Assembly symmetry: C2
Homo-oligomer: 273 residues x 2
């Protein structure tokens, strides 16, 4: 069949030709198209894009930090409007944001060192438990918020929702994001949610199926246009494979050493602002 990366490349070309000028939050310019979708097979391959080298180590590390439900920024290695707090900012305490919503949804916060077991909804364990109790369920949904929106009394809408789906012993995932930065964020997020799907499939005894990526405001930042035009002239190479190196029981038991990318052979890194 056609290489899955051709979808990404085709969407890039479509925004370049048919996108309309639209400003983002900071009043920076984009070309924008509303509503897009692409399907990447996860069967016997892994959609780490090859037309530029994607920062796989960052993908994997950040996903593990999310799964941990961590609110300590230092734990990551070592859009600055997310502001609040004096000495708390200093410590690297980010407040009740990111994976704190995946694992402790709606739990009253204390500090990043506080022990939140059993506080709030564990959206991720909920999804895994449902896959096990009722694989046919059409409600296998987890949501994630932008920290910026998180007054949260406000009933703020999600930034992204992942719906999982099970048929014939295969697990599929659809990510809906309200906006997608096509040049920087989108290649990263394809790897990240395809990884999440691989991890969930592993622990629930299923095979990965498809990753479907859906966007609302799919945009290209104006200064990404020239690099993206160049990237478009490159020919995708066969996707690599992802290997899980031992049998893992619980989602919290994965560590970066359990994962191996094989046959990854990308074009060179492109630096985008």
């Amino acid at each position: 069949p056609p290489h899955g990366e051709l979808q990404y490349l085709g969407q890039i070309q479509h925004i370049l030709r048919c996108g309309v000028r639209k400003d983002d939050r900071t009043g920076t310019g984009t070309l924008s198209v509303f509503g897009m979708q692409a399907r990447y097979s996860l069967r016997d391959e892994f959609p780490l894009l090859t037309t530029k080298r994607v920062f796989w180590k960052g993908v994997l590390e950040e996903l593990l930090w999310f799964i941990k439900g961590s609110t300590n920024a230092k734990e990551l290695s070592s859009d600055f409007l997310d502001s609040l707090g004096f000495s708390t900012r200093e410590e690297g305490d980010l407040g009740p944001v990111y994976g704190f919503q995946w694992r402790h949804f709606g739990a009253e916060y204390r500090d990043m060192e506080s022990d939140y077991s059993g506080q709030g909804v564990d959206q991720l364990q909920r999804v895994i438990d449902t896959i096990k109790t009722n694989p046919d369920d059409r409600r296998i949904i987890m949501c994630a918020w932008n920290p910026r929106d998180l007054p949260l009394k406000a009933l703020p809408p999600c930034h992204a929702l992942c719906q999982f789906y099970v048929v014939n012993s295969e697990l599929s995932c659809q990510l809906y994001q309200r906006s997608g930065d096509m040049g920087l964020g989108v290649p990263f997020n394809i790897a990240s949610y395809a990884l999440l799907t691989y991890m969930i499939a592993h622990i629930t005894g299923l095979k990965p199926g498809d990753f479907i990526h859906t966007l609302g405001d799919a945009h290209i930042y104006l200064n990404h246009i020239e690099p993206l035009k160049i990237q478009l002239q490159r020919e995708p190479r066969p996707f690599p494979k992802l290997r899980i190196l031992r049998k893992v029981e619980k989602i919290d038991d994965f560590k970066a050493e359990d994962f191996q990318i094989e046959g990854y052979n990308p074009h060179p890194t492109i630096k985008m602002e």
Copy 2:
């Protein structure tokens, strides 16, 4: 261009050929495909499907009842697991469900006659106010839940989310539904959300743009297969137009008499179980 209804027809054909057998909640069989998307222009036309006659009066009446935030079933004209309550069931009091979430999101309920002004989040007025204060916003999102899931302490996931989008004086809408009954529900919901978009555009001084319809579990009930095969042999006729008959100021001021479908020329009704 190709008639927009060809997308619907093409999705129907794809589920017939490539859908996999999957059971729904009641253990009734479907053919199912996970992840689909279609774009219907709302510019100078209205996507009331023509390959069977769609119940336009029902579409319009139900949408108005939702916009009213009504929990009185009698107010509609005159999946029975949504159960709870003795004399409350009798009165036609449905509890805090449907448009009660659009207009009074998270408000503690009393009874269907109770006066809830200013209680809970008004998701619909929120969306309209944002279109007016910041048309560029990527957070113009309203959500809707299946009444069945609404313990609601449970932080249950939405059944559907609508994201709105504004560029060049045009309002677009993307509906993401976690599951879509392609034979019965989907033609109805295309009309319903395209109508909602028309109404919102009218009051915010914008022109309708696109309606994008995205699904998670897109399915065909087994007993809809023969009628759908027949419907597929029919040639779409040009979409009709929708006319708003007077200038309307507030979303709550629309009534069924303000709307007129023109040039609607469908194939005959198909009865589907």
